[PDB]
């Protein structure tokens, strides 16, 4: 019976906030009181089980966003907007500070919005970025955080920007439609490499339209890519390869296994080329392992028509290139892992690597995490030997 009391109260408070929001000033004792009451009930709501979200959005919109919007449209205020925003932040900090809160990412993203709203050249604005990052560290399902991160940050490559937007579309709760990504793909780049990357992203995201033209264009992209890999003296491709991995993953999520399979082919070819050059940038391997992992995972899943895994519906030459790739990767992993040994229960956060990509050049624990995850897969291409004299940490399997 208390549920009805609570629900009625929260609904009423929200309605009143929406109503009196238009007429009164942002410092109104009425509106602030209503906000306090609203949060007070919303806590007891969050205590329950259920998605909620709609309620939190309601209170955020009629209680915080709208009053701020009205506040901007006023020439009669003496207070700096940054100060009001700060007060709002301290007010919303109550939710995060309360233990057993179900939705920390949401609140972190709202406070992040508050810091984003601040005028430029205000120091407190920095934290905006941070806040969104925190949200993502709490829940990578919030794609809006990825999008806004792709917008705010200054110290990032085109690769990282595309990574962030794509991840914004990959998230289970993605950032609306995904028109913005395409819009950015419309903008030309000033370097060959990034031009290639964008080309591949467009091709990967492109629907089945122009079926044969799709194939031919793809071939052209592969050739241009190979040509660029050979021609360029040497620069870390792990950014572009990360971008392509995420993009192909998005292609899988968006359409089908075939659409993804074309990308799988292209990227496999690319990797085999880069490793054919024998050039060994420390950052690449971290991404290669990840790609092997994701690809294996997708290949393991049963087809939509059922009765067979997706791996079974693969040509002989495809499985050949697949095993060649895996052989190269395993060989490089073993090459790195002589006298480095295996870390057990690394428990390393993936947040940093997810947000920024592979620029760091990895440490042993980090690699150990990924390598563990690879053998964890339902169909492992590699598997650690129980006891090794010197080399052969991982050995091929299920090929």
């Amino acid at each position: 019976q208390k549920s009805d009391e609570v629900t009625e109260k929260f609904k009423r408070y929200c309605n009143q906030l929406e109503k009196y929001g238009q007429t009164e000033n942002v410092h109104s004792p009425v509106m602030a009181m209503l906000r306090r009451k609203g949060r007070k009930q919303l806590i007891e709501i969050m205590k329950r089980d259920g998605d909620c979200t709609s309620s939190i959005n309601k209170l955020w919109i009629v209680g915080y966003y709208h009053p701020f919007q009205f506040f901007i449209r006023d020439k009669e205020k003496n207070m700096a907007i940054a100060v009001l925003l700060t007060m709002f932040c301290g007010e919303l900090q109550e939710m995060l500070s309360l233990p057993d809160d179900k939705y920390p990412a949401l609140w972190n993203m709202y406070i992040g919005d508050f810091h984003r709203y601040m005028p430029d050249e205000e120091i407190q604005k920095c934290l905006a970025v941070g806040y969104y990052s925190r949200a993502i560290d709490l829940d990578p399902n919030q794609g809006r955080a990825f999008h806004v991160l792709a917008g705010l940050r200054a110290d990032l490559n085109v690769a990282q920007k595309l990574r962030l937007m794509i991840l914004g579309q990959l998230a289970d709760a993605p950032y609306k439609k995904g028109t913005e990504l395409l819009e950015y793909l419309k903008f030309p780049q000033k370097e060959s490499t990034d031009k290639l990357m964008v080309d591949f992203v467009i091709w990967a995201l492109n629907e089945k339209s122009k079926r044969m033209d799709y194939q031919m264009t793809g071939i052209k992209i592969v050739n241009e890519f190979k040509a660029e890999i050979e021609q360029k003296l040497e620069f870390d491709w792990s950014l572009i390869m990360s971008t392509c991995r995420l993009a192909s993953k998005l292609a899988m999520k968006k359409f089908g296994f075939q659409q993804f399979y074309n990308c799988f082919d292209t990227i496999s070819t690319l990797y085999i080329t880069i490793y054919s050059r024998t050039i060994s940038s420390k950052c690449l391997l971290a991404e290669a392992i990840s790609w092997i992992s994701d690809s294996a995972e997708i290949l393991g899943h049963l087809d939509e028509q059922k009765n067979e895994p997706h791996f079974q519906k693969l040509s002989v030459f495809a499985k050949t290139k697949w095993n060649e790739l895996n052989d190269l990767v395993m060989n490089h992993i073993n090459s790195v892992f002589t006298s480095m040994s295996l870390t057990i229960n690394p428990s390393i956060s993936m947040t940093s690597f997810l947000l920024n990509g592979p620029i760091s050049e990895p440490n042993v624990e980090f690699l150990s995490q990924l390598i563990n995850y690879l053998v964890s897969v339902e169909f492992p291409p590699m598997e650690i030997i129980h006891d090794r004299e010197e080399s052969g940490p991982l050995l091929r399997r299920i090929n």
Binding site: A32, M87, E91, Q93, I123, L127, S133, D137, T351, S352
Partner: protein, 390 residues
């Protein structure tokens, strides 16, 4: 200092004072923090920050006839400013982890930052983090969320016990929860900390007054009896029955730092000579010696039942505290000699040389003269010294 910091300094000093011009000052302090966190902490700009903020809160609280709505508003504003200060510091400098129990709203995680300047001297980061936690504790106390306030306070105390303010605030929290004994202990720690928070004295007095005039003859819980008797010691009053009461009190004080520590403080202050001071010091002597006896016996019995030494760290620390007043232990040397010899033998032959206090003595400077951390050998040497002087 460099030219940039000096320019920022002039720009800082140019800013006017007052209730309304304060946010400008705060934000400029943030800018000076990000600019040079090291030098900022060097001149204790965290204190200046909290001073401007506390100023704002006070002036606004007063000017509005103590209205609740205004109070809440300025309070949440404060919370916002301080949180953003902590985060802005983290965003630019490699601040060491001080515990995953620390709220992540002030902390976040190392995974969300890019290129941070490395910390040069850790003392700055320790004092800063502890101070920020302390003031967030204050803010939580103002908002009447006592549990959170206590968490912030305990964390702050752990990071830097050398600031008596934290101990005092902990005392305030204890007093709010009607826990008077713990309040006395905390206020005492605040009084004799490494920073020495003198105001705590008043607090202590306030408690003493509320207990010194209780009918000791009448039945009451043990802790309350200790409070009334300590209070009667402080105000140079005659303890009604004395013998029985002091005996029981000492017997209980043998196992609690929250009685021993406040007793040291009152003893050191009283430590002089008057017609009444003599009587008071004698009361103290009775309690102290009783506690010494009981504790000695207990430790000896723990040696009997082959308890590992590490299984009694706090109990060894109360003993070392009891040894801080040799002049009080005169007269019972011969009686306690055997037990002392056995315990000393136990201490000499072992565990390794270190006794975890976790109560942070050594940041306690009331009548110390014991080099910390507590060495397994040093304690034995102290006991041997106490017995030897005879």
């Amino acid at each position: 200092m460099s030219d940039e910091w000096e320019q920022l300094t002039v720009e800082l000093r140019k800013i006017p004072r007052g209730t309304e011009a304060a946010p400008q000052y705060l934000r400029h302090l943030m800018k000076m923090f990000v600019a040079d966190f090291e030098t900022a902490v060097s001149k204790r700009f965290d204190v200046k920050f909290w001073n401007k903020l506390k100023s704002m809160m006070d002036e606004i609280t007063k000017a509005m006839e103590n209205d609740r709505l205004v109070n809440h508003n300025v309070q949440n504003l404060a919370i916002g400013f301080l949180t953003d200060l902590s985060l802005l510091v983290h965003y630019h400098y490699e601040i060491p982890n001080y515990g995953n129990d620390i709220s992540k709203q002030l902390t976040w995680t190392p995974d969300v930052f890019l290129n941070r300047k490395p910390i040069k001297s850790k003392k700055n980061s320790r004092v800063f983090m502890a101070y920020v936690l302390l003031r967030m504790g204050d803010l939580m106390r103002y908002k009447e969320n006592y549990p959170k306030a206590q968490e912030y306070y305990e964390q702050s105390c752990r990071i830097n016990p050398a600031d008596g303010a934290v101990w005092n605030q902990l005392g305030l929290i204890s007093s709010l929860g009607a826990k008077n004994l713990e309040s006395v202990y905390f206020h005492t720690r605040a009084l004799h900390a490494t920073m020495e928070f003198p105001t705590a004295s008043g607090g202590l007095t306030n408690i003493f007054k509320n207990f010194a005039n209780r009918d000791i003859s009448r039945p009451m819980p043990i802790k309350d009896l200790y409070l009334s008797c300590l209070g009667r010691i402080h105000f140079l009053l005659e303890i009604e029955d004395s013998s029985v009461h002091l005996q029981k009190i000492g017997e209980e004080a043998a196992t609690s730092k929250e009685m021993i520590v406040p007793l040291m403080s009152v003893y050191k202050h009283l430590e002089d000579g008057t017609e009444l001071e003599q009587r008071a010091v004698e009361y103290v002597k009775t309690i102290w010696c009783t506690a010494y006896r009981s504790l000695l016996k207990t430790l000896d019995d723990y040696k009997e039942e082959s308890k590992k030494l590490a299984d009694v760290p706090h109990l060894l620390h109360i003993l070392a505290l009891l040894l801080c007043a040799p002049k009080l232990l005169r007269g019972i040397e011969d009686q306690t000699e055997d037990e002392v010899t056995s315990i000393c033998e136990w201490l000499l032959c072992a565990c390794d040389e270190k006794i975890k206090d976790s109560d942070a003595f050594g940041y306690f400077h009331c009548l110390q003269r014991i080099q910390y951390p507590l060495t397994r050998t040093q304690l034995a040497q102290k006991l041997v010294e106490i017995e030897d002087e005879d």
